[PDB]
């Protein structure tokens with residue numbers, strides 16, 4: 001069985017770590033919901 | 039019980055539990071990615087949540103009512119992933135999204151890498167609105183990950 005349990009409130013955090021780049025990628029989405037790089 | 043917030047999705051298997059994903063309770067509806075639950079029912083305390091709407095191609099499912107999350111990325115502001123990884127405390131990570139370019143238009147995308155059971159973690163705008171869920175993505179050449187900001191149609 002699958003069950004849910006609360007993990008927190010949903011809020012923006014002001015002192016947040018910032019990281020990750022901003023890639024621009026050509027992708028396709030197929031009927032199964034898979035994205036693939038083109 | 040349906041109190042607004044972010045939730046882990048767990049499966050009780052063999053002995054202990056395993057976190058298979060994450061979802062958002064809002065306006066009495068639970069929102070998660072299809073690949074987390076495979077569209078099957080959920081327990082919430084003593085109460086059963088039944089699937090209401092879903093789409094394998096979008097990789098989304100809502101429980102108890104239609105998809106309620108309607109806010110969208112503005113296409114240029116930084117966002118926060120409220121990552122809820124297995125075995126770890128919920129935490130906020132800010133990032134400037136990249137873009138999935140598709141034949142049908144552009145999708146915001148975040149280059150942040152977490153375990154599979156983090157799927158369904160909400161991505162937020164600066165008003166704290168959920169602009170989509172994390173976890174349907176691609177693996178680029180160096181092995182790192184980029185997730186679409188996946189949002190339903192309200």
Ligand SMILES: CC(C)[C@H]1NC(=O)[C@H](NC(=N)N)CCCCNC(=O)[C@H](CCCCN)NC(=O)[C@H](CCCCN)NC(=O)Cc2cccc(c2)CNC1=O
Pocket residue numbers: 032033034035036037073097151152153154155156157172173174175176177181182183
């Ligand atoms: C951190 C730890 C290192 C963990 N990291 C990850 O697992 C992903 N990070 C990554 N750097 N690999 C983020 C997973 C985020 C949650 N999201 C999914 O789990 C969906 C579930 C499926 C949704 C399908 N509609 N998976 C996808 O989006 C994509 C893209 C699917 C591409 C389809 N052409 N699949 C994968 O990454 C599978 C994979 C590949 C190599 C190697 C691995 C895992 C081994 N790594 C891991 O165990």
